[PDB]
Design a protein around this ligand. Structure first.
Ligand SMILES: CCCCCCCCCCCCCCCCCC(=O)OC[C@H](COP(=O)([O-])OCC(O)COP(=O)([O-])OC[C@@H](COC(=O)CCCCCCCCCCCCCCCCC)OC(=O)CCCCCCCCCCCCCCCCC)OC(=O)CCCCCCCCCCCCCCCCC
Ligand SMILES: CCCCCCCCCCCCCCCCCC(=O)OC[C@H](COP(=O)([O-])OCC(O)COP(=O)([O-])OC[C@@H](COC(=O)CCCCCCCCCCCCCCCCC)OC(=O)CCCCCCCCCCCCCCCCC)OC(=O)CCCCCCCCCCCCCCCCC
Ligand SMILES: CCCCCCCCCCCCCCCCCC(=O)OC[C@H](COP(=O)([O-])OCC(O)COP(=O)([O-])OC[C@@H](COC(=O)CCCCCCCCCCCCCCCCC)OC(=O)CCCCCCCCCCCCCCCCC)OC(=O)CCCCCCCCCCCCCCCCC
Ligand SMILES: CCCCCCCCCCCCCCCCCC(=O)OC[C@H](COP(=O)([O-])OCC(O)COP(=O)([O-])OC[C@@H](COC(=O)CCCCCCCCCCCCCCCCC)OC(=O)CCCCCCCCCCCCCCCCC)OC(=O)CCCCCCCCCCCCCCCCC
Ligand SMILES: CCCCCCCCCCCCCCCCCC(=O)OC[C@H](COP(=O)([O-])OCC[N+](C)(C)C)OC(=O)CCCCCCCCCCCCCCCCC
Ligand SMILES: CCCCCCCCCCCCCCCCCC(=O)OC[C@H](COP(=O)([O-])OCC[N+](C)(C)C)OC(=O)CCCCCCCCCCCCCCCCC
Ligand SMILES: COC1=C(OC)C(=O)C(C/C=C(\C)CC/C=C(\C)CC/C=C(\C)CC/C=C(\C)CC/C=C(\C)CC/C=C(/C)CC/C=C(\C)CCC=C(C)C)=C(C)C1=O
Ligand SMILES: Nc1ncnc2c1ncn2[C@@H]1O[C@H](COP(=O)(O)OP(=O)(O)OP(=O)(O)O)[C@@H](O)[C@H]1O
Ligand SMILES: [Mg+2]
Lengths: 58, 140, 99, 49, 231, 256, 54, 54, 67, 41, 96, 60, 77, 108
């Protein structure tokens, strides 16, 4: 399984683990306490952009 | 054990018979001397340099796979495959180019391997016996 | 042992703390993680991170002098590619509708 | 202070103004499968796993 | 044994144990048609069929190297489903993921098939190795049965059936031969049998606190110089 | 007809729509049956990833432009923009302003060629919502039991009959367009429950909506006909008739 | 204080304990799975006596 | 009836990958690097003495 | 019940009258740590236990509070 | 079991044909050297 | 034969720019620096994976079997496991 | 059955050529003024959108 | 305590012996030696606390089909 | 046109049903052969595959086997509607009638 994470470039620790317990132990005192989202790939980018009647897409 | 050790055995086959059978058990000092220079499997015969290469080769290769396995900058231009907004797509081929440049790490090591050294000042010092010379020696 | 060796402890949790920030939704962490390494030798001079590079050249700050240029060019291109991504409507994404 | 303001503006704020994420979705077939998949495992849950 | 004492271990700024929508400043916001001129988005409604076709390819492309092993195709199928049922049974609310979990998992599975098309996925190589180790042991049994010889596995089954008769032949006060008694009889035979084998030391410490490795040779010194090969 | 098509046998009408997350292209095209290890080629040749991107991304993209080349041969793309590019190319060495005005009409031509050569994609979700609202269709077809047997949808060539569509007899509009922007096709459907089959023939044209300059719907079904066929019953449904739809709305006549 | 590096020690020192108690923690999880399994095997012990009861 | 049991001939072998070996594994992980790392630094230099060298 | 009974009891958890005037250690031991002693791991456990009693084993209060 | 080689109680001919795990690694490396003849050539 | 092959010259590079001899030094350092950074990131996912796969399970939830756990159970069982199953079967399902 | 899982909440926009057709160009922007003459009307008639016009005039 | 002695004798305070033997070797073992990467006949320890699933009945048939009475049970079920 | 069967290469055979009765007998034999199917004798023309221990992913393996036996090329848009034995039967007829009238195979 470790080779599968490496060959798919899923090198974000605990992304494919449903309960990233190791991620909670490291963030017990972190600023913006958060754990990685499930199955997050370091290459995916879901960013969007729109143009409105106002500026800055507002 | 490796082939080079086996080659020594066929050459030292008669020598082993003299030390291990005759000297290693005759008596007294001839025994201590024959049992000390015994011939057989090498105790602590591992070669750390061989292993050092195997480790660094494997560790550096795992880095090549990461640096070389990148999404294409060309395919992201059409906004039709897997990439709409990639504001750092122009960084895709930096690490690959950096790894391919690593093939010249040892080919071009030191100043002498990057130019014609006889036209450089350090060459004069080596031919003068590694001796300090005035900086304008190449002109006079 | 990753639980007794403080060397792998520091590096492991540090990297996890760096990659977890992909949830901030800046951009592909797989793309800009390499620039972070270069930017670290620009501002890491304050912490002497360039120490191990003192024998690698005749200039101790060589890697820091190149990284600041790299940091400038690729940061200068981030807005340019963003407009290329908007398309011909890119002016509406900035200012909006005309008057 | 200037170190934070540099990255907090060039990347964090700059992208918050000119980029966004949509709230509307185009496909929601995971929601309905988890319900059906949970009914297939109703008995195993009854055993308290 | 040991339990996590921190009650806030699973707390996040988004809620308890939230790994589907972490809290970030640039949050999703709605779009209004009457005010929207143009938009650049990659989301679509093609993930459902890509999830279907991806399963068919990963299955059909891995079966190329099973050599018609029906038992392997069925075992592999059970393993392939376990990889596709992750979003249907996970604690993570895959339907509430930030920007669409459906598109996320599909794109992740596609990267796996890419490796499968080249026959380089670790699960493939793991499957070939695991199967070859299994068939070698099944062929060793077949060759021993064709020779009329008894397998090591049958000698235990026969040695265990008689040990049960000896136990129930004396258990007349009671007559409930539980599964627990049947179990500890077999374990007593396995430990004795396993100890008989010349196996490498697995446990760090043997009966004494000392380690069972070749390095745990301390004083006193009683070994002479090493001897050479004999002719 | 589908313009973007590779040697891949599955999902023809979705090949241009589906955006795969592959880093490179798979070793072999999607298998239609279980094959043998020797049927494929291990360790593909060198420069294989570059070869696939040419025969799976470039070539089918050029075959699309060649299939629909009759829609870009207009006087605006052929004579005006190139001639405007040459007038400023003679002065490109005088200043930078001439290089821009010489390349702009070429980037503009590419954009029109790009947009005009794409396969005509209508809002299929509006279509299925329309037929599933009709009781005569829902009597034999349901989304959970319907399957597609064939699909054809392509632009109509040249100008149409100048009595049903007198709009296209405009010398100013012809200067920008050589085609009509209308499309005609059909849909072969089947229902695995009732065993019914139907051919959903339809014609489309761009129309204006609610605004002055912008198009409302580039593919508006002004004729939508369904010839339903079942075990022993043949029905003909008319969801949208052209004789009554063309009296209310007219095409849009795209420019540029 | 800048206790970032300390937070990394406390978690590693806590995981060091969870690993030392792996056998006990897992053994307790099975004590409940074995309870479920033993409960389902009670249906077979009842049927094996029906022939004698009859 | 059970004593009459026989066995079927199983398959001779599975697929053998021509580009994967134990010493040159095709895919990468920190497990093989650890194996090569400890081969390099060698086994734990256990002192058999009663007192430390220094 | 007896566990919660004593937790709520004021007498069982009550600082002595002079407790305010006494010298109070305002650290849990995370400022200066012994890194190379054989009881290193045992020291960390007492720091972790002291931090938990201050927050009723809800360390979110520590993350939000001042260090 | 007891016929396993011992570096002390070893024969000369046996050491010459030992072929242990060390050689097993080398034989895997040799398989790559041979397969690279066309690429290097 | 073309003049493009002149780029292979380093004996007389001091006549045109004398820049190649200095830039590759940085490139060799940049590769070394990234080798240490990336190798640490990609390698150090194993401690998290090793821990979570062995301690993240809880009794109030169902642990679902993975691909590897399927192959190991069906195609990597040992002799004692084969014996124990048939030992239970013959005694309870056959011999009661 | 892909239409079964299609969410109709995506009909808020009608995207075509990277533009939403449900944009009230008659009330907002350069196209809102109805007092435009022959040239300004023929200009928008070609591009149909102020966003594409402004983008091209940016380089011109 | 925090005052254990000189730096040279620091590795002395680590050994804890389970027997009354004197003198005592000072070295305290850190890890278990693993010279040969041997494939363990031991079964994997991941198969620890996995709830009932499809793999349980698929393996039961494989083991039942190894007996005459089991082949009847499977076919009828 | 050959496949490995238990390590041995075997020539594959294609079927031509062209009859309603032969289709029902084929599908039943197909579903009963699938190792996940329950109550194989309780299977009939009006049997829901979900009622026999089959899910959406098992309907794919069945379609994958139809392409092996009949030579069909089934698109992913058609598989998720095959949830009953009656569905496999009617789809096969629609494919045979389409090839008899249009002279070509359905769109894949
Ligand atoms: C020293 C120099 C320093 C400067 C450095 C700058 C470097 C910049 C690098 C950036 C990258 C540039 C590369 C561009 C790639 C373009 C590729 C492409 O062609 O794709 C098309 C693509 C458009 O596609 P799309 O938007 O995705 O979708 C289109 C819709 O579908 C379309 O919908 P529609 O069909 O409804 O629209 C209708 C039509 C409407 O069009 C119109 O508006 C019409 C205009 C009027 C035409 C004339 C009408 C005449 C009428 C005559 C009537 C005759 C009547 C006759 C009657 C007949 C009588 C019988 O619109 C179009 O089709 C045209 C859109 C495309 C125009 C592209 C223009 C590109 C010009 C670039 C020129 C210079 C390039 C130099 C490169 C050099 C590289 C070495 O073009 C773009 O996206 C343009 C984006 C570029 C933005 C770049 C901004 C970067 C910043 C630059 C300035 C920064 C200044 C600050 C400097 C600070 C220091 C750093
Ligand atoms: C949103 C970003 C804000 C950016 C602000 C810009 C920077 C301001 C610099 C001010 C200097 C002090 C900085 C204190 C923060 C230190 C945080 C830190 O270093 O990270 C530890 C932190 C974890 O370590 P920690 O020990 O658990 O953190 C808690 C603290 O240790 C201790 O925990 P705590 O609970 O006790 O304290 C909580 C923390 C909360 O901080 C905040 O929430 C930020 C709020 C906005 C800024 C407020 C302070 C601004 C400075 C005011 C200066 C007043 C000068 C008045 C001069 C009067 C005389 C003329 O600090 C404060 O509460 C600040 C209150 C200040 C009260 C001042 C009292 C009167 C003093 C008057 C004497 C004047 C002497 C001046 C001499 C010069 C300074 C020494 O690492 C992270 O969390 C990573 C995430 C980083 C967050 C975003 C970046 C923020 C910048 C941090 C440095 C860059 C981090 C990445 C480095 C990458 C390396 C691989
Ligand atoms: C023409 C004639 C010339 C040739 C003549 C031929 C003979 C030449 C001499 C050859 C000697 C070979 C045999 C002795 C070698 C080992 C000696 C030794 O102390 O190691 C025992 C010691 C432990 O032995 P143990 O008593 O059995 O305790 C076992 C426990 O596991 C230990 O762990 P624990 O925590 O449980 O117990 C505490 C631990 C406490 O010790 C430690 O845990 C770490 C000690 C610090 C290590 C050094 C860190 C330096 C960072 C790198 C910077 C320099 C790199 C060198 C190259 C720089 C560029 C030139 O060890 C101790 O028990 C007490 C430590 C005794 C002092 C340690 C420092 C010795 C100097 C090592 C660095 C020498 C290079 C710098 C000197 C100046 C260069 C001009 O092991 C080490 O110290 C390892 C460090 C590396 C040692 C070899 C380094 C090369 C040879 C050093 C000779 C030392 C004298 C010359 C330098 C002194 C200048 C002030
Ligand atoms: C001098 C140096 C020259 C150097 C030349 C260098 C070489 C140049 C060659 C290249 C030329 C550039 C290429 C341009 C084309 C490129 C494409 C393009 O950009 O689009 C066209 C572009 C479109 O313009 P637009 O701004 O987008 O249109 C605005 C609205 O959209 C339009 O809205 P609308 O269409 O709905 O209606 C418009 C109009 C309605 O208009 C109409 O309806 C009239 C239509 C009449 C049509 C005529 C038909 C003729 C047919 C031919 C004749 C019949 C055939 C007979 C044949 C006979 C054969 C012999 O309604 C109005 O009421 C407009 C507001 C009232 C006028 C405001 C004027 C402000 C001027 C302020 C300065 C005042 C100076 C006065 C004193 C001057 C004394 C020298 O054209 C221009 O940009 C024109 C140039 C604008 C530059 C203004 C900056 C300069 C300020 C003025 C000069 C101030 C004086 C400075 C020095 C004074 C020294 C004494
Ligand atoms: C050591 C050698 C190598 C070093 C390499 C560098 C390692 C860096 C280590 C990781 C640093 C991560 C910093 C993330 C800070 C996020 C904190 C947070 O979540 O906010 C919570 C905060 C606070 O909430 P909180 O609950 O998390 O914390 C509360 C804090 N107290 C206790 C004090 C109250 O709230 C917010 O959401 C505000 C968000 C503001 C974000 C501003 C930071 C933007 C900078 C990041 C973008 C940089 C991109 C650079 C890309 C460059 C590419 C070329
Ligand atoms: C006069 C001197 C010539 C000057 C040099 C000019 C070089 C021209 C060729 C190199 C540049 C090609 C454009 C690259 C950028 C586009 C990338 C791309 O391929 O995307 C494809 C895209 C593919 O679409 P896509 O990339 O968005 O993805 C589709 C959807 N998915 C991802 C799901 C599959 O299609 C096109 O862009 C349309 C075709 C592009 C046409 C390019 C020009 C080809 C010219 C052929 C010349 C033929 C005659 C002369 C040669 C005769 C041969 C004997
Ligand atoms: C291609 O991609 C890449 C890798 O692959 C993944 C890498 O691993 C790596 C990492 C590289 C490494 C870890 C290797 C690093 C090696 C370095 C730094 C230099 C090593 C130096 C030595 C080992 C010392 C050698 C000393 C000498 C050669 C001097 C004395 C001469 C000797 C010993 C040989 C005698 C000379 C001769 C010409 C005769 C040759 C003799 C033979 C060929 C006999 C061979 C005999 C047999 C039995 C094979 C990189 C950079 C890379 O780019
Ligand atoms: N409501 C929306 N919000 C944000 N982005 C959208 C929305 N609708 C569409 N988009 C984007 O516009 C693109 C084109 O939309 P379009 O309707 O033509 O796709 P489609 O697959 O042809 O739909 P259909 O199957 O109904 O024909 C889409 O791929 C999407 O990225
Ligand atoms: Mg469409």
């Amino acid at each position: 399984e470790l080779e599968e994470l490496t060959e798919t470039h899923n090198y974000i620790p605990g992304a494919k683990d449903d309960v990233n317990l190791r991620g909670y132990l490291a963030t017990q005192f972190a600023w913006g306490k958060k754990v990685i989202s499930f199955y997050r790939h370091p290459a995916d980018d879901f960013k969007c952009a729109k143009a409105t009647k106002n500026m800055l897409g507002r | 054990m490796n082939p080079i050790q086996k080659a020594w055995l066929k050459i030292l086959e008669p020598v082993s018979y003299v030390i291990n059978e005759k000297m290693a058990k005759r008596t007294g000092i001839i025994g201590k001397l024959g049992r000390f220079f015994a011939i057989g499997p090498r105790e602590y015969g591992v070669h750390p340099i061989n292993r050092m290469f195997i480790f660094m080769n494997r560790k550096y290769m795992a880095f090549q796979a990461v640096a070389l396995h990148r999404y294409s900058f060309v395919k992201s231009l059409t906004h039709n495959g897997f990439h709409m907004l990639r504001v750092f797509r122009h960084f895709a081929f930096v690490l690959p180019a950096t790894v391919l440049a690593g093939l010249g790490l040892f080919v071009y090591w030191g100043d002498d391997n990057k130019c014609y050294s006889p036209d450089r000042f350090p060459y004069l010092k080596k031919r003068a016996g590694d001796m300090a010379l005035p900086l304008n020696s190449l002109n006079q | 042992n990753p639980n007794t060796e403080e060397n792998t402890i520091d590096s492991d949790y540090l990297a996890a703390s760096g990659t977890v920030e992909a949830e901030k939704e800046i951009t592909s962490i797989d793309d800009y993680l390499g620039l972070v390494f270069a930017i670290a030798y620009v501002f890491g001079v304050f912490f002497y991170v360039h120490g191990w590079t003192s024998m690698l050249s005749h200039a101790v700050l060589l890697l820091s002098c190149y990284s600041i240029i790299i940091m400038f060019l690729f940061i200068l291109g981030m807005p340019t590619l963003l407009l290329y991504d908007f398309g011909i409507f890119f002016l509406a994404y900035l200012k909006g509708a005309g008057k | 202070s200037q170190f934070v303001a540099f990255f907090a503006i060039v990347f964090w704020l700059f992208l918050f103004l000119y980029t966004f994420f949509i709230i509307e979705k185009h496909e929601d077939f995971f929601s309905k499968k988890r319900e059906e998949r949970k009914k297939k495992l109703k008995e195993l849950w009854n055993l308290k796993n | 044994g040991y339990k996590i004492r921190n009650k806030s271990i699973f707390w996040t700024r988004a809620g308890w144990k939230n790994n589907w929508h972490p809290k970030n400043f640039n949050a999703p916001r709605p779009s209004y048609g009457e005010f929207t001129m143009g938009i650049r988005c990659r989301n679509d409604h093609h993930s459902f069929l890509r999830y279907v076709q991806t399963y068919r390819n990963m299955s059909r492309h891995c079966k190329q190297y099973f050599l018609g092993d029906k038992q392997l195709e069925e075992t592999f199928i059970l393993g392939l489903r376990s990889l596709f049922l992750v979003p249907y049974d996970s604690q993570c609310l895959t339907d509430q993921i930030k920007h669409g979990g459906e598109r996320r998992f599909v794109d992740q599975l596609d990267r796996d098939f890419e490796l499968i098309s080249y026959n380089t996925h670790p699960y493939q190589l793991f499957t070939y190795t695991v199967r070859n180790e299994h068939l070698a042991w099944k062929n060793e049994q077949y060759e021993k049965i064709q020779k009329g010889e008894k397998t090591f596995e049958q000698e235990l089954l026969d040695y265990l059936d008689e040990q049960v008769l000896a136990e129930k032949a004396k258990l007349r006060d009671g007559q409930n031969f539980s599964i627990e008694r049947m179990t500890e009889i077999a374990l007593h035979v396995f430990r004795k049998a396993r100890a008989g084998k010349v196996r490498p030391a697995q446990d760090v410490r043997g009966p004494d606190g000392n380690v069972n490795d070749f390095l745990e040779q301390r004083r006193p010194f009683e070994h002479p110089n090493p001897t050479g090969v004999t002719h | 007809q589908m313009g973007f098509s590779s040697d891949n046998p599955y999902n023809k009408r979705w090949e241009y729509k589906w955006k795969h997350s592959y880093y490179t292209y798979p070793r072999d095209y999607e298998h239609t049956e279980v094959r043998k290890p020797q049927d494929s080629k291990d360790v593909p040749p060198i420069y294989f990833a570059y070869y696939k991107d040419f025969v799976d991304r470039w070539l089918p993209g050029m075959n699309m432009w060649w299939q629909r080349r009759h829609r870009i041969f207009d006087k605006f793309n052929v004579y005006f923009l190139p001639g405007m590019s040459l007038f400023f190319y003679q002065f490109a060495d005088l200043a930078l302003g001439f290089k821009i005005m010489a390349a702009f009409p070429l980037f503009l031509a590419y954009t029109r060629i790009r947009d005009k050569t794409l396969d005509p994609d209508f809002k299929e979700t509006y279509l299925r919502d329309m037929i599933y609202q009709n009781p005569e269709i829902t009597k034999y077809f349901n989304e959970e039991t319907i399957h597609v047997l064939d699909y054809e949808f392509e632009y109509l060539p040249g100008y149409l009959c100048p009595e049903k569509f007198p709009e296209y007899q405009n010398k100013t509009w012809q200067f920008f367009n050589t085609d009509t922007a209308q499309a005609e096709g059909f849909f072969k459907f089947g229902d695995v429950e009732s065993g019914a089959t139907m051919t959903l023939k339809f014609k489309t044209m761009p129309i204006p909506g609610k605004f002055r300059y912008q198009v409302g719907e580039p593919f508006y079904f002004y004729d939508l006909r369904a010839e339903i066929k079942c075990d022993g019953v043949y029905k003909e449904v008319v969801l949208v008739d052209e004789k009554e739809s063309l009296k209310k709305i007219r095409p849009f006549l795209f420019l540029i | 204080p800048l206790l970032q590096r300390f937070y990394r020690r406390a978690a590693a020192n806590e995981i060091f304990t969870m690993e030392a108690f792996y056998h006990e923690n897992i053994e307790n999880k099975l004590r409940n799975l074995m309870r479920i399994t033993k409960g389902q095997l009670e249906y077979w012990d009842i049927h094996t006596s029906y022939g004698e009861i009859r | 009836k059970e004593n009459t049991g026989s066995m079927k001939k199983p398959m001779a072998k599975a697929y053998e990958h021509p580009y994967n070996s134990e010493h040159h594994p095709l895919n990468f992980s920190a497990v093989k690097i650890a194996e090569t790392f400890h081969d390099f630094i060698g086994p734990e230099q256990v002192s058999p003495h009663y007192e430390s060298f220094a | 019940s007896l566990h919660e009974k004593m937790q709520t009891d004021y007498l069982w958890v009550k600082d002595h009258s002079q407790a305010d005037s006494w010298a109070k250690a305002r650290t849990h031991g995370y400022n200066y740590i012994a890194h190379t002693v054989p009881n290193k791991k045992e020291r960390y456990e007492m720091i972790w236990r002291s931090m938990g009693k201050s927050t009723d084993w809800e360390l979110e209060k520590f993350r939000l509070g001042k260090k | 079991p007891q016929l396993w080689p011992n570096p002390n109680k070893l024969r000369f001919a046996d050491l010459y044909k030992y072929q242990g795990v060390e050689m097993k690694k080398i034989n895997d490396s040799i398989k790559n050297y041979k397969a690279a003849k066309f690429y290097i050539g | 034969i073309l003049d493009y092959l002149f780029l292979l010259d380093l004996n007389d590079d001091l006549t045109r720019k004398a820049v190649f001899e200095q830039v590759i030094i940085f490139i060799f350092i940049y590769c070394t620096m990234n080798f240490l950074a990336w190798s640490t990131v990609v390698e150090l996912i194993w401690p998290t994976h090793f821990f979570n796969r062995r301690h993240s399970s809880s009794q109030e939830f169902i642990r679902f079997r993975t691909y590897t756990e399927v192959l190991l159970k069906i195609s990597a069982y040992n002799d004692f496991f084969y014996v124990l199953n048939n030992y239970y079967y013959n005694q309870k399902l056959i011999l009661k | 059955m892909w239409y079964k899982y299609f969410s109709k909440q995506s009909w808020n926009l009608r995207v075509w050529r990277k533009a939403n057709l449900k944009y009230n160009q008659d009330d907002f922007g350069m196209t809102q003024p109805k007092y435009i003459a022959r040239f300004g009307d023929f200009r928008f008639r070609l591009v149909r959108t102020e966003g594409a016009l402004r983008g091209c005039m940016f380089f011109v | 305590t925090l005052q254990w002695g000189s730096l040279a004798e620091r590795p002395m305070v680590d050994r804890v012996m389970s027997t009354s033997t004197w003198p005592v070797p000072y070295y305290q073992r850190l890890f278990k030696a693993y010279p040969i990467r041997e494939k363990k006949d031991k079964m994997s320890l991941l198969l620890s606390d996995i709830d009932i699933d499809d793999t349980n009945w698929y393996q039961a048939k494989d083991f039942l089909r190894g007996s005459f009475r089991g082949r009847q049970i499977v076919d009828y079920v | 046109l050959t496949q490995y069967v238990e390590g041995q290469i075997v020539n594959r055979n294609q079927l031509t049903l062209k009859k309603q009765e032969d289709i029902e007998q084929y599908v039943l034999k197909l579903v009963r052969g699938y190792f996940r199917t329950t109550n194989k004798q309780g299977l009939n023309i009006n049997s829901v595959l979900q009622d026999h221990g089959l899910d959406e992913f098992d309907s794919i393996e069945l379609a994958m086997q139809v392409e092996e036996d009949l030579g069909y090329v089934i698109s992913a848009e058609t598989i998720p509607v095959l949830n009953k034995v009656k569905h496999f039967v009617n789809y096969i007829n629609h494919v045979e009638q389409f090839k008899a009238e249009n002279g070509k195979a359905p769109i894949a």
